[PDB]
């Protein structure tokens, strides 16, 4: 599944009712007003964050003029396709050599349940007692990507030798909110001048995702050398999704 | 490393020549070298036959021109063109004598909503110094104008003065930034050039010779 | 004239009227040749004040009505079928002995130009297509089937000036091998150019209802022509 | 943020005959401010937000032509918008072109009066939320677009 | 003591057509992205130069004549390094049949003639035949020597007979194209021609409009003084006065017999400067109407001045005459009840 192309985004109309699942193009290029809809707020925050990152690498405005303008007016589908073109081969959940936020070829004695990506459902000795079971039985492609991202960002790391994210463990995330999900996502994207004022991109600084150019074991990374793409989508752990089962219901 | 003088060319209408012996008087999209030399040469009190002062000025000075786009009330305003059907009645028939045509006609092009920021500097073989130029731009002796005498300025000719290695880098300190730049001096990153016929051949009145700009896109 | 020195200089000359007639067409190898069967062969000459890119198809593309580029260029087409083209083109536009306009250009084309002529002709005819769309529409505004004012030529000027930025760039930098999408884009930008110019032109008169009628009709014919330009 | 048009429409349709009667007596949009029933009608629809007042005043005023003078009809699934005001006015076969002429050239206030007369006379069938947006802005551009739609419709039909 | 005088004028014209092109359509220009009606630099300047006011106060000035006799000494040692005094005195005597400065176009043309006289001396050409060869040029320059002020102010006539390069005389006054402060709604007149012998029709159209125009001009005092033979600043200021008056009253003549837009300007501001500047950017963002276009235009002018004057370095005496009583301008700009008072103010260098 590919985050830029396929339908993964769980939404319901700003005003409306029945939930449906859209693709990024439908979000960026439509005056339809959307709001996220999952049964958990932390996962909605994970989602929103993911979308914001995505938009931050595909389409930063070139000035405040354009910024305001694009908030007020959706893109044309062609503009979009042109914007996402160079990035598509980086956002495949299941891929041959570069799986999204995963690491190919992981050595593990046993399979970790899906629940361990769902922050809070288990992890403490009183969880089996107070929580409903089965929530990590089988997850959507979306619920999964979103969980993956949340685990490498705002959630605490698994423990022993599982490094936490770039902002430290359990950071607070603060976003500006808009009328719809669209304008929200756009509203938390740094314009090109602010973006390069905050990150001057060198030949010295690696700007490739972690799942394309891997972190070397026990490397000592100068924080300065990490590029905004590499860091926004930083993945500090060695995770690799097992082969998917068939049709059914996101638990 | 090198000192630069920074001028601003802006007004309602602007006219910068192209080759013509006909009545159509064309305009290009940004100031000509002959034009800029003429402007400076005009602030300085340089009569037309003073071939010495002309030459002095020409071999002394070099230009790099940046095209500023207009933003109004936060909407972008492209530069547009204008054609003026311009007649003359009582025009001379010969270069000698007093016989005249009843009416002759010329078409003259102008640039609308055009604004430029120019950076000039001295060459190795200079006969002049920058503060002569600055002093003139601040207190010109002849009336200055953007191309034709019917195009005033809406902004002072003098913008500022600074120093750097590039003309580019010098231009970076004056907004708006992001415009295309045409420099007589090469800039390492950029290979594109723009053919022109700007150079005035002082030895030969009112004739011009080919040259090339270095193009630094924004 | 030169500004250079020379031992001998000429100060005048002698001419007198002389007449003859050369029946037929001499195959001069420096100029393209337009062919029209009503048969009529005639060498290319600047006729209007339009931009140079409107003549490009007659300069680089063979077509057997049809067209015949200069021998020089097709020799070069055979000899170096893997080389780009940098072509000098020039001439006058005249009213008897009077020079109205002088033209000189150095067109550029990457490799594919020898074989993919049809693409070049496509581009040019697309440009002229949009031009005639705008012109037809504003003519409609002017006359009817009337506003009282002709605005179409001025608008054609504006159009042409912006086309100067658009089309040549395409011809000089396009990959003919696969060129559909660059062309598509050109079509779009031209489309919105015609919309913008139409509105800008009729804008000062649309405060009066009677003009808004004819304006609406004109706009109709405009979008008819514009939509027909989408394959 | 944006004004609900369909809600207001249905509200106007189900209004009690007395209130409707009370509103139908204005002869000018601002007179709606003299009328209790009006404020009761538009209170749910954001009257209390100054941004929406002028807009609402126009909407109601046009609706105040009659309880079912403006027949709403949904657009077809295929096309992007429904029937425009001009088009409907033209479709009625009861509206003369000069009426629209003098409409788009009228001063403020007067235009709305004239418009309401045209609506009573035509009983148009149209996409109401569309007309509502139009009334929300109602400037040169919109007046012009009205006359254009009228002209082109009358031309083909 | 600044070199440049700036003149800004706001004038409103009732429905008319003061300037059109080859297609009989009013002249055009885009400014600030919006279209403005234009009156050309040419049209307006001609309006001035061919006026009766110009004729009486420029074409009939005292400084209008250049006496060659009084220019002997200065001429000769400005030309001594190119010509012998014989050839010079002969030439000057030919032209004519105490002073220490001389207008450059004079020096240039005199030089050309001198050259010709020497040229004719070398071939021992008869004097009678010499004059017979250059009768025309003599007449020409004899004319131009009678129109000193005119040439100093406006420049050479389009048919002048000037031969040299110093003969390419620029006007001391530079006149801009006039554009409207606002976007214009143009009108179209539909007329017919009644045939009194068959009144039983074929319509023609003329475009026309009304508008508030911003006229701008500047005067290069130094250049004026120089091209009058070194005349004083007071005199140049006199001339300047006349030019102000004209820019405030003179109106092109086009179609005025049938549209009669005979309007005087409603605002006239004069402003001294080292660098001449147009205030056209006051109207870059086009004026929107509010009880007319005139008041808002004037207001936009004043407030532009307030906003940018000092920053753009327009530090120099400045006065404003205006009929409309809108919100006044900076305390430093002196108000004037009458044009004549503004004129007098200019005449005495601005105090």
Q: Which residues pair with B112 in a beta bridge?
A: B13, B80
Nearest CA-CA partner of A170 in A191, A151, A189, A183: A151
Long-range contacts of A192-195 (CB under 8 A, 24+ apart): A192/A60, A192/A61, A192/A62, A192/A63, A193/A62, A193/A63, A195/A56, A195/A60, A195/A228
Portion 73-92 of B in contact with A at CB < 8 A: 74, 76
Q: What is the DSSP letter of E289?
A: P
Rounded CA Rg of chain D: 15
Rounded CA Rg of chain E: 25
Alpha-helical segments (H) within chain B: 33-43, 51-60, 130-138, 167-171
Write out the two tokens for A159.
């423990």
What domains lie within chain D, and their CATH numbers? 1-157 (1.10.520.40)
Q: What is the DSSP letter of B100?
A: B
Write out the two tokens for D29.
């949009």
Q: Which residues pair with C98 in a beta bridge?
A: C95
Cα–Cα distance measured from residue E87 to residue C188, given in angstroms and rounded to the nearest whole number: 73
> Do β-strands E204-220 and A34-36 pair in parallel, antiparallel, or remain unpaired?
unpaired
Give the SS3 label for residue D59: helix
Cα atoms in the 13 Å half-sphere on the side-chain side of C228: 10
Cα nearest neighbour of E203 on chain C: C148
Q: Which of C209, C219, C220 is the closest to D105 by Cβ?
A: C209
Gap from B53 CA to chain C (nearest CA, Å): 19
Q: What sign results for the dihedral spanned by CA atoms E285, E288, E294, E296?
A: negative
Q: Does E190 touch chain C if contact means CB atoms closer than 8 Å?
A: yes
Other C-beta atoms closer than 10 Å to the C-beta of A205 total 16
The answer to whether the CB atoms of C219 and D155 lie below 8 A apart is no
Write out the two tokens for B213.
């700009």
The answer to whether the CB atoms of A68 and B71 lie below 8 A apart is no
Cα–Cα distance measured from residue B216 to residue A173, given in angstroms and rounded to the nearest whole number: 41
Cα nearest neighbour of E28 on chain C: C154
Give the SS3 label for residue E132: helix
Q: Are D67 and D120 in contact, with CB atoms under 8 Å apart?
A: no
Other C-beta atoms closer than 10 Å to the C-beta of B123 total 14
Domain containing E35 equals 1-351
Q: Which residues pair with D130 in a beta bridge?
A: none
Breaks (C-N over 2.5 A) in chain A follow: none
Q: Which residues pair with C63 in a beta bridge?
A: C67
Rounded CA Rg of chain A: 18
Nearest CA-CA partner of B158 in B10, B2, B1: B10
Portion 52-111 of A in contact with B at CB < 8 A: 65, 68
Give the SS3 label for residue B1: coil
Write out the two tokens for E166.
């110093």
The answer to whether the CB atoms of B22 and C154 lie below 8 A apart is no
**Residue holding tokens 């936009």?**
E300
State the method: X-ray
Give the SS3 label for residue E65: coil
Cα–Cα distance measured from residue E75 to residue E103, given in angstroms and rounded to the nearest whole number: 10
Cα atoms in the 13 Å half-sphere on the side-chain side of C117: 18
Cα nearest neighbour of B76 on chain A: A65
Residue of B141, B154, B202 to mutate when probing chain E, most E C-beta within 10 A: B154
How far is the CA of C57 from the CAs of A41, A113, C66, C123, in angstroms? 62, 67, 11, 9
Burial class (CB in 10 A: 0-12, 13-18, 19+), C211: buried
Give the SS3 label for residue C46: coil
Dihedral over alpha carbons B70, B72, B74, B80 (to 10 degrees):
-50
The answer to whether the CB atoms of C207 and E185 lie below 8 A apart is yes
Nearest CA-CA partner of E212 in E172, E267, E167: E267
SS3 content of chain C, % helix, strand, coil (to 5): 50, 15, 35
Please name the chains neighbouring E, where neighbouring means 3+ C-beta pairs under 8 angstroms.
Answer: B, C
Q: Which residues pair with E28 in a beta bridge?
A: E37
Nearest CA-CA partner of E267 in E204, E198, E329: E329
Cα atoms in the 13 Å half-sphere on the side-chain side of B64: 26
Cα–Cα distance measured from residue B147 to residue B9, given in angstroms and rounded to the nearest whole number: 10
The distance of Cα E262 from the centroid of its chain, to the nearest Å, equals: 20
The answer to whether the CB atoms of B22 and C161 lie below 8 A apart is no
> Do β-strands E28-31 and E34-39 pair in parallel, antiparallel, or remain unpaired?
antiparallel
Q: What angle do CA C38, C42, C43 make, to 5 degrees?
A: 155
Q: What is the DSSP letter of C146?
A: -
Q: Are B101 and B91 in contact, with CB atoms under 8 Å apart?
A: yes
Q: Are E180 and E282 in contact, with CB atoms under 8 Å apart?
A: no
| Sequence-distant (≥ 6) Cβ neighbours of residue E156 within 8 angstroms | E105, E144, E162, E167, E168, E169
Gap from B74 CA to chain C (nearest CA, Å): 19
Cα–Cα distance measured from residue C124 to residue C119, given in angstroms and rounded to the nearest whole number: 9
Cα–Cα distance measured from residue E235 to residue E241, given in angstroms and rounded to the nearest whole number: 10
What angle, rounded to 10 degrees, do the helices at E104-122 and E85-96 form? 110
Cα–Cα distance measured from residue E157 to residue A191, given in angstroms and rounded to the nearest whole number: 58
**Residue holding tokens 């706001």?**
E10
How far is the CA of C114 from the CAs of C82, C120, D18, E190, in angstroms? 9, 10, 82, 56
Q: Are E254 and E7 in contact, with CB atoms under 8 Å apart?
A: no
Cα–Cα distance measured from residue A75 to residue A27, given in angstroms and rounded to the nearest whole number: 10
| Sequence-distant (≥ 6) Cβ neighbours of residue A121 within 8 angstroms | A115, A127, A131, A135, A136
Nearest CA-CA partner of A228 in A53, A90, A84, A89: A53
Instruction: Determine which helix (DSSP H) or strand (DSSP E) holds E16, and give its type and residue range.
Output: strand E4-16
Cα–Cα distance measured from residue E220 to residue E7, given in angstroms and rounded to the nearest whole number: 12
Portion 132-161 of C in contact with B at CB < 8 A: 154, 157-158, 161
Burial class (CB in 10 A: 0-12, 13-18, 19+), A53: buried
Q: Are E216 and E7 in contact, with CB atoms under 8 Å apart?
A: yes
Q: What is the DSSP letter of E280?
A: G
- How does DSSP assign C90-133, residue by residue? EEEEEETTEEEEEEEEEEEE-GGGTT-HHHHHHHHHHHHHHHHH
Cα–Cα distance measured from residue B116 to residue A205, given in angstroms and rounded to the nearest whole number: 36
Write out the two tokens for C108.
């550029």
User: Resolution reached, in Å?
Assistant: 3.0
Other C-beta atoms closer than 10 Å to the C-beta of B205 total 12
Write out the two tokens for E292.
């007319």
Which chain A residues contact residue B76 at CB under 8 A?
65
Q: Are D151 and D111 in contact, with CB atoms under 8 Å apart?
A: no
Cα atoms in the 13 Å half-sphere on the side-chain side of C124: 18
Gap from A174 CA to chain B (nearest CA, Å): 29
Cα nearest neighbour of C102 on chain B: B20
Chains C and B touch (3+ CB pairs under 8 A): yes
Cα–Cα distance measured from residue A145 to residue A211, given in angstroms and rounded to the nearest whole number: 14
Residue ranges per structural domain of chain A: 1-251
Query: How far does chain D reach from its first CA to its final CA, in angstroms?
Result: 38
Q: Does B24 touch chain C if contact means CB atoms closer than 8 Å?
A: yes
Which chain D residues contact residue C213 at CB under 8 A?
97, 147, 151
Q: Which of C153, C154, C205 is the closest to E186 by Cβ?
A: C205
Write out the two tokens for A144.
């999964």
**B-E contacts (CB, under 8 Å):** 145
Nearest CA-CA partner of D128 in D69, D47, D77, D51: D69
Nearest CA-CA partner of D70 in D57, D90, D85, D81: D85
Peptide bond into E8 cis (omega under 30): no
Q: Which of E35, E184, E207 is the closest to C149 by Cβ?
A: E207
Cα–Cα distance measured from residue A48 to residue A56, given in angstroms and rounded to the nearest whole number: 12
**Residue holding tokens 């700003």?**
A14
The answer to whether the CB atoms of C217 and D144 lie below 8 A apart is no
- How does DSSP assign E150-197, residue by residue? HHHHT---SS----SSTT----SEEEPPEEESS----EEEEE----TT
Architecture of domain B1-218: 2-Layer Sandwich (3.30)
- How does DSSP assign B110-171, residue by residue? EEES-EEEEEEEE-TT-SS-HHHHHHHHHS-SSPP-SSSTT---SS-SEEEEEEES-HHHHH
Query: Based on the structure, what is the number of domains in chain E?
Result: 1
Write out the two tokens for E312.
């753009």
Q: Are B194 and B182 in contact, with CB atoms under 8 Å apart?
A: yes
**Residue holding tokens 């629209």?**
D100
Which chain C residues contact residue E28 at CB under 8 A?
154
Residue of A61, A62, A63, A68 to mutate when probing chain B, most B C-beta within 10 A: A63
Cα–Cα distance measured from residue C205 to residue B143, given in angstroms and rounded to the nearest whole number: 39
Q: What are the backbone dihedrals phi and psi of residue C181, each rounded to the nearest 5 degrees, phi first?
A: -75, -35
Please name the chains neighbouring B, where neighbouring means 3+ C-beta pairs under 8 angstroms.
Answer: A, C, E
Nearest CA-CA partner of C204 in B109, E207, E19: E207
Rounded CA Rg of chain B: 18
Q: Are A56 and A10 in contact, with CB atoms under 8 Å apart?
A: no
Q: Are E219 and E4 in contact, with CB atoms under 8 Å apart?
A: yes
Alpha-helical segments (H) within chain D: 5-13, 17-23, 36-42, 53-63, 85-92, 97-104, 110-122, 128-137, 140-156
Instruction: Determine which helix (DSSP H) or strand (DSSP E) holds B188, and give its type and residue range.
Output: none
**Residue holding tokens 């020597």?**
E145
Q: Is A221 left (phi over 0), alpha (psi -120 to 50) or beta?
A: beta
**B-C contacts (CB, under 8 Å):** 23
Nearest CA-CA partner of D125 in D80, D88, D79, D84: D88
Give the SS3 label for residue C59: helix
Cα–Cα distance measured from residue D37 to residue D8, given in angstroms and rounded to the nearest whole number: 14
Nearest CA-CA partner of E11 in E240, E322, E303, E271: E322
> Do β-strands D125-126 and D71-72 pair in parallel, antiparallel, or remain unpaired?
parallel
Cα nearest neighbour of E187 on chain C: C205
- Biggest CA pair distance of chain D: 45
Cα–Cα distance measured from residue E308 to residue A172, given in angstroms and rounded to the nearest whole number: 47
Q: What sign results for the dihedral spanned by CA atoms D101, D104, D107, D109?
A: positive
Give the SS3 label for residue B82: strand
Which chain B residues contact residue C157 at CB under 8 A?
81, 83
Which chain B residues contact residue C106 at CB under 8 A?
195
Q: Are E19 and E252 in contact, with CB atoms under 8 Å apart?
A: yes
**Residue holding tokens 């003369």?**
D96
Q: What is the DSSP letter of E288?
A: P
Q: Are A190 and A56 in contact, with CB atoms under 8 Å apart?
A: yes
Cα–Cα distance measured from residue E58 to residue E49, given in angstroms and rounded to the nearest whole number: 9
Nearest CA-CA partner of B78 in B66, B67, B86: B67
Cα–Cα distance measured from residue E102 to residue E66, given in angstroms and rounded to the nearest whole number: 9
The answer to whether the CB atoms of C99 and B24 lie below 8 A apart is no
**Residue holding tokens 């409707």?**
D20
The answer to whether the CB atoms of C148 and E184 lie below 8 A apart is no
Q: Are E178 and E261 in contact, with CB atoms under 8 Å apart?
A: no
The answer to whether the CB atoms of B76 and A65 lie below 8 A apart is yes
Cα nearest neighbour of B100 on chain E: E159
| Sequence-distant (≥ 6) Cβ neighbours of residue C120 within 8 angstroms | C56, C57, C60, C61, C109, C113, C171, C176
Chains E and C touch (3+ CB pairs under 8 A): yes
The answer to whether the CB atoms of B76 and A68 lie below 8 A apart is no
Which chain B residues contact residue A193 at CB under 8 A?
none
Burial class (CB in 10 A: 0-12, 13-18, 19+), E194: exposed
3-state secondary structure chain A: CECCCCEEEEEEECCCCCCEEEEHHHHHCCCCCEEECCCCHHHHHHHHHHHHHHHHHHCCCCCHHHHHHHHHCCCCHHHHHHHHHHHHHHCECCCCCCCCCCCCCCCCCCCCCHHHHCECCECCCCHHHHCCCCCCCCCCHHHHHHHHHHHCCCCCCCCCCCCCCCCCCCCCCCCCCCCCHHHHHHHCCCCHHHHHHHCCCCCCCECCCCCCCCCCCCCCCCHHHECHHHHHCCCCCCCCCCCCCCCCCCC
Q: Which residues of C touch E (CB under 8 A)?
A: 147-151, 153-154, 200, 203-205, 207-208, 211
Write out the two tokens for C149.
């004012």
| Sequence-distant (≥ 6) Cβ neighbours of residue E166 within 8 angstroms | B47, B48, B49, E104, E105, E107, E108, E109, E111
Q: What are the backbone dihedrals phi and psi of residue E194, each rounded to the nearest 5 degrees, phi first?
A: -75, 130
Q: Which residues pair with E36 in a beta bridge?
A: E29
Which chain B residues contact residue A65 at CB under 8 A?
71, 74, 76
Gap from E285 CA to chain B (nearest CA, Å): 7
Cα–Cα distance measured from residue E224 to residue E247, given in angstroms and rounded to the nearest whole number: 18
**Residue holding tokens 């799986």?**
A99
């Amino acid at each position: 599944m590919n985050l830029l192309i396929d339908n993964w985004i769980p939404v319901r109309p700003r005003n409306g009712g029945k939930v449906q699942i859209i693709n990024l193009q439908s979000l960026y290029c439509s005056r339809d007003q959307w709001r996220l809809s999952l049964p958990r707020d932390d996962m909605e925050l994970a989602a929103l964050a993911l979308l914001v990152c995505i938009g931050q690498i595909i389409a930063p405005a070139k000035d405040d003029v354009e910024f305001r303008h694009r908030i007020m007016n959706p893109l044309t589908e062609d503009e979009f396709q042109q914007l996402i073109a160079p990035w598509i081969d980086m956002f495949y959940l299941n891929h041959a050599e570069h799986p999204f936020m995963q690491t190919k070829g992981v050595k593990a004695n046993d399979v970790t349940p899906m629940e361990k990506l769902l922050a809070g459902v288990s992890g403490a000795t009183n969880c089996a007692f107070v929580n409903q079971p089965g929530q990590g039985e089988a997850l959507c492609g979306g619920c999964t990507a979103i969980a993956l991202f949340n685990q490498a960002n705002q959630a605490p790391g698994f423990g022993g030798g599982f490094k936490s994210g770039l902002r430290g463990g359990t950071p607070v995330t603060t976003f500006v909110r808009g009328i719809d999900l669209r304008s929200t996502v756009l509203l938390n994207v740094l314009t090109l001048p602010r973006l390069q004022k905050q990150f001057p991109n060198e030949s010295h600084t690696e700007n490739q995702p972690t799942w394309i150019k891997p972190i070397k074991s026990n490397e000592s990374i100068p924080a300065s050398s990490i590029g905004f793409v590499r860091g926004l989508f930083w993945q500090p752990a060695h995770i690799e999704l097992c082969d998917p089962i068939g049709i059914g219901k996101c638990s | 490393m090198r000192s630069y003088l920074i001028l601003r060319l802006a007004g309602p209408m602007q006219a910068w020549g192209q080759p013509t012996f006909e009545g159509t008087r064309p305009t290009g999209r940004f100031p000509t070298r002959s034009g800029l030399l003429g402007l400076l040469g005009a602030c300085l009190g340089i009569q037309r036959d003073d071939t010495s002062s002309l030459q002095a000025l020409s071999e002394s000075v070099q230009f790099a021109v940046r095209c500023d786009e207009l933003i109004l009330d936060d909407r972008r305003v492209s530069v547009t063109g204008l054609r003026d059907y311009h007649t003359v009645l009582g025009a001379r028939e010969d270069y000698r004598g007093l016989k005249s045509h009843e009416t002759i006609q010329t078409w003259r092009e102008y640039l609308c909503d055009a604004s430029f920021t120019v950076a000039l500097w001295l060459t190795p073989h200079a006969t002049m110094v920058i503060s002569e130029l600055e002093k003139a731009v601040l207190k010109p002796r002849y009336t200055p104008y953007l191309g034709r005498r019917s195009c005033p300025l809406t902004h002072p000719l003098f913008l500022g003065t600074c120093q750097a290695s590039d003309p580019q880098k010098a231009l970076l300190n004056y907004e708006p930034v992001g415009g295309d730049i045409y420099s007589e001096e090469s800039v390492t990153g950029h290979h594109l050039k723009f053919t022109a016929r700007d150079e005035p051949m002082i030895t030969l009145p009112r004739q011009f010779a080919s040259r090339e700009w270095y193009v630094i896109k924004g | 004239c030169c500004g250079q020195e020379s031992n001998l200089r000429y100060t005048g000359f002698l001419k007198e009227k002389f007449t003859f007639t050369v029946n037929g067409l001499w195959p001069h190898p420096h100029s393209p040749c337009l062919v029209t069967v009503k048969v009529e062969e005639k060498f290319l000459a600047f006729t209007t004040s339009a931009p140079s890119w409107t003549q490009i198809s007659r300069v680089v593309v063979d077509k057997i009505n049809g067209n015949r580029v200069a021998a020089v260029v097709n020799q070069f087409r055979n000899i170096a079928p893997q080389s780009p083209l940098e072509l000098i083109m020039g001439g006058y536009r005249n009213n008897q002995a009077s020079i109205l306009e002088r033209r000189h250009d150095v067109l550029m084309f990457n490799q594919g130009w020898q074989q993919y002529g049809n693409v070049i002709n496509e581009i040019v005819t697309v440009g002229l297509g949009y031009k005639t769309a705008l012109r037809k529409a504003l003519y409609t505004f002017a006359e009817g089937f009337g506003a009282g004012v002709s605005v179409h030529e001025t608008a054609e000027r504006h159009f042409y000036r912006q086309s100067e930025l658009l089309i040549p760039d395409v011809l000089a930098n396009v990959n003919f091998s696969q060129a559909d999408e660059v062309i598509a884009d050109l079509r779009d930008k031209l489309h919105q150019l015609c919309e913008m110019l139409f509105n800008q032109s009729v804008a000062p008169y649309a405060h009066h209802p009677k003009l808004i009628s004819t304006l609406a009709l004109a706009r109709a014919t405009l979008y008819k022509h514009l939509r027909e330009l989408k394959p | 943020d944006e004004i609900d048009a369909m809600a207001l429409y249905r509200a106007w349709q189900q209004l009690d005959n007395g209130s409707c009667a009370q509103i139908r007596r204005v002869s000018e949009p601002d007179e709606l401010r003299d009328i209790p029933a009006f404020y009761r009608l538009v209170q749910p629809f954001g009257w209390e937000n100054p941004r929406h007042q002028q807009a609402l005043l126009r909407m109601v005023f046009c609706l105040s032509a009659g309880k079912n003078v403006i027949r709403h009809q949904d657009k077809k699934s295929e096309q992007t918008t429904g029937i425009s005001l001009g088009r409907a006015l033209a479709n009625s076969g009861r509206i003369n072109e000069r009426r629209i002429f003098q409409l788009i050239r009228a001063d403020r206030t007067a235009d709305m009066v004239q418009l309401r007369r045209l609506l009573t006379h035509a009983e148009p069938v149209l996409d109401w939320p569309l007309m509502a947006r139009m009334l929300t802005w109602w400037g040169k551009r919109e007046r012009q677009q009205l006359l254009e739609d009228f002209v082109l419709t009358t031309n083909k039909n | 003591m600044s070199n440049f005088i700036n003149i800004h004028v706001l004038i409103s014209h009732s429905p008319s057509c003061l300037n059109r092109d080859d297609m009989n359509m009013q002249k055009d220009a885009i400014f600030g992205g919006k279209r403005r009606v234009r009156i050309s630099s040419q049209s307006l300047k001609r309006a001035m130069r061919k006026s009766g006011y110009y004729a009486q106060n420029i074409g009939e000035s005292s400084l209008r004549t250049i006496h060659l006799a009084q220019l002997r000494d200065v001429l000769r040692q400005k030309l001594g390094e190119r010509f012998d005094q014989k050839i010079i005195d002969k030439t000057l005597a030919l032209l004519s049949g105490s002073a220490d400065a001389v207008t450059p176009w004079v020096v240039g043309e005199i030089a050309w003639f001198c050259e010709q006289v020497a040229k004719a001396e070398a071939d021992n050409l008869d004097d009678k035949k010499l004059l017979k060869v250059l009768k025309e040029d003599i007449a020409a320059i004899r004319v131009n020597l009678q129109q000193g002020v005119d040439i100093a102010l406006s420049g050479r006539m389009a048919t002048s007979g000037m031969m040299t390069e110093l003969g390419k005389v620029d006007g001391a006054m530079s006149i801009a194209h006039a554009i409207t402060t606002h976007q214009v709604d143009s009108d179209i007149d539909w007329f017919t021609a009644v045939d009194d012998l068959q009144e039983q029709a074929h319509l023609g159209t003329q475009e026309f409009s009304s508008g508030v125009f911003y006229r701008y001009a500047n005067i290069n005092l130094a250049q004026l003084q120089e091209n009058l033979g070194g005349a004083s600043r007071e005199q140049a200021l006199e001339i300047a006065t006349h030019v102000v008056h004209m820019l405030a009253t003179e109106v092109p003549g086009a179609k005025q017999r049938t549209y009669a837009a005979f309007n005087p300007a409603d605002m006239v501001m004069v402003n001294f400067s080292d660098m001449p500047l147009s205030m056209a950017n006051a109207f870059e963002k086009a004026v929107k109407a509010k009880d007319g276009f005139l008041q808002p235009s004037i207001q936009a002018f004043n407030q532009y001045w307030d906003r940018v004057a000092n920053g753009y370095g327009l530090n120099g005496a400045a006065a404003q005459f205006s009929l409309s009583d809108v919100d006044p301008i900076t305390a430093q700009v002196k108000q004037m009840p009458t044009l004549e008072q503004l004129k007098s103010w200019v005449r005495n260098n601005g105090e």
